[PDB]
Design a protein around this ligand. Structure first.
Ligand code: CAP
Ligand code: CAP
Ligand code: CAP
Ligand code: MG
Ligand code: MG
Ligand code: MG
Ligand code: MG
Lengths: 467, 129, 465, 228, 119, 118, 129
């Protein structure tokens, strides 16, 4: 009369709701924002999410008794109601480290976000945060280089890095692409880049582009005396094609390549990050598709989790939003995940969306990249938000300058350098930013020209992804 | 608790977990073929009636998938009686063989149904103990 | 017409309501929710611009090329019935914009940045028209339904599968033990759970070898071809390929891959490997509901299914309709046709926004799995027909007598239902009677019927049309 | 319609003058010269049959598949102006018939056997319509005109080349000598003669090395990109 | 020999009728992989012509039907069957599927007849 | 020159290639084929096998019977150019598979004016 | 339609699809050998009379192609009676063996004919059903 096998359905909460569990320093912890169907108890809901993302299915199975469920089960150990919502809860789930394959972000996601979002019993689910314990973090190769090593390789210190996406997104020939890249880089930018969707196309084949961009990088570098790069896109249909692109970039001796980690995927990405580590290539990460998953407050996965995942899978740069540009990103939320991207140790802080203390155990930090509808007038706000350890990208903001790319690039570089100097001199950029730019306009004709064109332009809309 | 026997409990794909088909049940399957415009055909085996691997081992390779075709698929045939008569003719010529009735769809180009009609000489209820 | 620096409306270039779409254009249908004070035309134009050639301000480089040739074009905007602020925006993309054979590239363009635009509050990609001229550039599924049935020598009924449970925690030896008992009772396939990869409690290669022993023992005992979807999902492409190669060395018929958590680049690689080595590829859609559950935002599963068909897979999970996970009947019937058929007509009552021509690309076998048991069998056969795989994890390993009786119960149920259908019985009306008769006859089935008699999954649907 | 063994006319299956061609069909225009007593329609059907699905007698296996979906179709026959026995037969082939990316496979079907048929006295394939859906399956040219001009940095005129002569018989060193002199005087390219491969008088690798020396010397002397 | 000359304006037609390949050139070629004698010796087939057969329809059969047809041909007395010249790899039938099914067919017909078979 | 050979050709022990006779042939052609090619040849029957009224196995048997009958006749000293019709007819009387093929194709000939004349 | 039987219908290369050879027919084949100057030889098998694959699997490899040679090829023999007498002697010494008469051409260096003369103890008309 010990616990035997009893066939049939029973509540998930009998096994998977454990509110007295003391979490272990090796557990992976998840924070789910959960919206139950009417008549489903929050405890049963939390237990369902814990069960079906770890060991349990819909009915009792006899095979449980061959192993130790206590050792392996995910556990919903706490449920908070959400302030000012009648049907929303934060459920906290603890997962034993034994559940996960070492060094595989793919495996982690498959368990934690695999099936539970489609359960009938819930109306909406959102993964808000994960606590990756040091013992799991250490199993990942992580970023190929990280912020410090990257500055050391490029010999660039004491300011944000400046980049620019070539436009139009699609439609330029290989030769014209290189032409544009040279003009941008010679004017003062550190980097240019392939657009996320520039891969290999009828109007421009990848290898032709790589060779012309290489010519442009070296010419601009010899002309200015500063190290230059351009994020050549390795994103591809197959791993084999992706690797071919990476290998050609290496043969060309260029410093940096890029990858769309979500549309390419984690498996491909981790492979590419390993390649980059082994061959000294820097790896820029574009986050295309993230907003399909992370825009809405009630359902999906918050970008902070996608950022944590990218850090583990591997990337030297990762797009972080701009706060003030054409794409959404609230200030406090962004400040929180920028800390999670860059820092070694980040304390729990709900006012910045950080649900868990996160310890990165010396894994290298990822450089945040602010990009999307920004121009010279945004410079003081960007320097204020991100500080030096960030890369600021101006596509339209450079190729849309009335005098062409080289003046465009100079205007951006003058603006950034003015702001940096002002900050170092003790000026408050939040208050005095407009004045810093206005002074620089009076002084630099290239900057003035850019200031006139974009003076009116702001992106102010109601935020969807509110805390 | 009953135990599903591993002793001689060989199966033959579709319908082998049901009671053996009566003459009325076979005729109903034939009507189904005809109502759907599928091409009936008979195949028989005088040796191994099961899949095995003798000549090669790679994924998706098996010996014993092909049986010997009885005459030709009955193209254009819309007559259930004709089909039933060929079953009798085939089993008469090969009274010791595995024999199966299959039907083809030429649009999808695939066999669309099939079941055993004769085996060489476990009962439906002696499968558990 | 010269270069004029500065911002102007997207609609001056990217809204073209008189455009006649070309037979080679990729078409998108976006369900769009503008911010207050953003005109729908400006919104659609913005989506079209920023998913193709345009950025937020005029760039001089446009004049080096032909924007007319390359621009995406919002060519039609319908309001949505019974919504004050929702529109369907139709966007046409020239075939030149896309890399041949790359689902990754297609997604990057069409769903890359636009979903994050401040100017909209929500966005959902509902459908894509993949023209034949693009379709032909993909290797596509390694085998497809017909060739699969031909390889396994299985005809005339749905395939029967089952996921080993518990999901995680079983040893390699116990896994194989479970697999042998399942397969010998009457199932065609068993499978690794989507998250079973390689872990401290069970390393992948140990599992593959024990599972192989179990497959071959069950096959020799029953005389029917058997398989088990060994999971190739991994952290790197190299590891993924190691697992596929070991499956091939073992001679097993089928492997699996989680296409969305592994990713399209890895998936397409694996599909090509499978085509070159005769391995069948089962696709698990883990994570899809992160993207596709909500009506106002994301990408509808039918698009993710179309993308899988192009990237490549022999099976793909399709939902059950009646089980523990969501999937409405008319929506499901719509994308099941998209997965299997060669030609599917526009049909808004089933969620099909575009006529889709697959130009002889092999069809993918839908897999119905998740909280189903013997009483659901008539509804499943009615919904899917024969060209489907039905999977019973808990429904097999939860049977009071163990796996072999569990498997036998499911097989009897499926065969009874198939026979009844062929005899002309209407499963939608007479289904309960078919099962009840089979209970009276088979003790294994009777025992399953008693355990799960009460069990239903009936909730309000979120992903409504 | 069952299986009926024996020979019947090709035109009963393969002549379909009311067929509306599809945008994915490969289309062929054949200039056809029938033997006396062979009706042009039967000739066009034979061509279409034997370059697609059919043979000289009826086979039972047809019924396992859909001939309608796969058959080549002679869909039009024009007489040729001022010829008593010449016709243009138009044949449509479904895209399913061809291997993706393989010119070899296309030729093998379309021009594989039909040219040798006893029933015709002559045959000429005049044109093909390759539909975009087939075109997209090919890698196609490695670069093409525009990319080529961009790589060489050469614009606004025709390119100038020259074949080394005599065709055969020059040594590797003399080949390079000739190549340098040509390139340095204003030509963009020189070239191996079509039949210059690797031979007793001149082995290929020796030639490649001396020609490389020549290309680079002429390029440094003139300032213009050179090739051979 | 046939590179350019057929297109010369100065002639209206040209036909190469024959070539004399001298032994000194012939010896520089690997030539046939086996040749008649070695072929007969490998197949163990002597004293009559070999019998083959092309599967039809030329295009349009599935891989499984191809092997079905091949087994029935070979078991009745033919030595060989063959892919039609234009059967390579196509939507209706991919090459590797065909190779596997034809292999099953060859070996089944061989075991049934006791004579070496091929396709 | 009467066989179109303009030059003496010496192959210096390079292996010979087996000729394959294929294209629109059937059982009635068998004597002519054996007479023209002898034993060192492969004879191919596509339509001539898959177009047999009883299916492939009987079709193949019919071809194999025909070829074997002709080979035997030749070895016994019969002149296939003269007696070929009789060899097949005798074999028809004996083998039902062959007889069925003989009936289907009895009328079928391919006689046209030759283009590639010497 | 008659069905060509798959049971037990094993063949033996040249002439096995004809009615079994009479003594007069065998003698006629021997005259053919002698008239052509070929070298007659007898081979016999006391085990498997068929090709198989036990020891290796690669293209063009088969076990069972070689039989055991009876004495030596009859070099220089132009006497049909002598050949006929060796057939009798061989079958006498191995009455249960497969025995075959072959002939060699030493110019082409290949076996130029061969047929079975004895098998161990389907009829020409029971091959279809
Ligand atoms: O393709 C574009 O739209 C950009 O090049 C910006 O162009 P502009 O500089 O012309 O605005 C970036 O890729 C997006 O910013 C990505 O968004 P995010 O950084 O939020 O991921
Ligand atoms: O993890 C599970 O729950 C399952 O193994 C089913 O188990 P049970 O049979 O025991 O329920 C399947 O992987 C999910 O159904 C996948 O979901 P979907 O098919 O919706 O993509
Ligand atoms: O494709 C065909 O038509 C054949 O398969 C014959 O089929 P049938 O046996 O059914 O007529 C052969 O390829 C032709 O003989 C080639 O001609 P040739 O040998 O003259 O080059
Ligand atoms: Mg971009
Ligand atoms: Mg699962
Ligand atoms: Mg020349
Ligand atoms: Mg042919």
């Amino acid at each position: 009369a010990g616990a035997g096998f009893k066939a049939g359905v029973k509540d998930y909460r009998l096994t998977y709701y454990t509110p007295d569990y003391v979490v272990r320093d090796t557990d992976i912890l998840a924070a789910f924002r959960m919206t139950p169907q009417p008549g489903v108890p929050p405890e049963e809901c939390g237990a369902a999410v814990a069960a079906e993302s770890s060991t349990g299915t819909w009915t009792t199975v006899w095979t449980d008794g061959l192993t130790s469920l206590d050792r392996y089960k995910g556990r919903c150990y706490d449920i908070e109601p959400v302030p000012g919502e009648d049907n929303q809860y934060i459920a906290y789930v603890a997962y034993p480290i034994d559940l996960f394959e070492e060094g595989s972000v793919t495996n982690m996601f498959t368990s934690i976000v695999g099936n539970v979002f489609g359960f009938k019993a819930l109306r909406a689910l959102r993964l808000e945060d994960l606590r990756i314990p040091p013992a799991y973090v250490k199993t990942f190769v992580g970023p190929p280089h990280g912020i410090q090593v990257e500055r050391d390789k490029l010999n660039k210190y004491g300011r944000g890095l400046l980049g620019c996406t070539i436009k139009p997104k699609l439609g330029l020939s290989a030769k014209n692409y290189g032409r544009a890249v040279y003009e941008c880089l010679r004017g003062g930018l550190d980097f240019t880049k392939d657009d996320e969707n520039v891969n290999s196309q009828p109007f421009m084949r990848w290898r032709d582009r790589f060779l012309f961009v290489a010519e442009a990088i070296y010419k601009a570098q010899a002309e200015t005396g500063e190290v230059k790069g351009h994020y050549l896109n390795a994103t591809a249909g197959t791993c084999e094609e992706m690797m071919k692109r990476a290998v050609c970039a290496k043969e060309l001796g260029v410093p940096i390549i890029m990858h769309d980690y979500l549309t390419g995927g984690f498996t491909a990405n981790t492979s590419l990050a390993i390649y980059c580590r082994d061959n000294g290539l820097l790896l820029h990460i574009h986050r295309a598709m993230h907003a399909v998953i992370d825009r809405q407050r009630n359902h999906g996965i918050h970008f902070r989790v996608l950022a944590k995942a990218l850090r583990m899978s591997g990337g030297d740069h990762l797009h972080s939003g701009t706060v003030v540009g054409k794409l959404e990103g609230e200030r406090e939320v962004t400040l929180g995940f920028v800390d999670l991207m860059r820092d070694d140790y980040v304390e729990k802080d709900r006012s910045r969306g950080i649900y868990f203390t996160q310890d990165w155990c010396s894994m290298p930090g990822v450089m945040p990249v602010a990009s999307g509808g920004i121009h010279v007038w945004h410079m003081p706000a960007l320097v204020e938000i991100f500080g030096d350890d960030a890369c600021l990208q101006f596509g339209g903001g450079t190729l849309g300058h009335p005098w062409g790319n080289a003046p465009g690039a100079a205007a951006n570089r003058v603006a950034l350098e003015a702001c940096t100097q002002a900050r170092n001199e003790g000026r408050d950029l939040a208050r005095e930013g407009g004045d810093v730019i206005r002074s620089a306009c009076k002084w630099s004709p290239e900057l003035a020209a850019a200031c006139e064109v974009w003076k009116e332009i702001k992106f102010e809309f109601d935020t969807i992804d509110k805390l | 608790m009953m135990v599903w026997t591993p002793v001689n409990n060989k199966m033959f794909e579709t319908f082998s977990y049901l009671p053996p088909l009566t003459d009325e049940q076979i005729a109903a399957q034939v009507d189904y073929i005809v109502a759907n415009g599928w091409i009936p055909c008979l195949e028989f085996a005088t040796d191994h009636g099961f899949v095995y691997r003798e000549h090669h081992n790679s994924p998706g390779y098996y010996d014993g998938r092909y049986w010997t075709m009885w005459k030709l698929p009955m193209f254009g045939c819309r007559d259930p009686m004709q089909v039933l008569r060929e079953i009798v003719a085939c089993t008469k010529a090969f009274p010791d063989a595995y024999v199966r009735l299959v039907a083809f769809d030429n649009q999808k180009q695939v066999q669309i149904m099939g079941f055993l009609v004769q085996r060489p000489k476990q009962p439906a209820n002696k499968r558990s103990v």
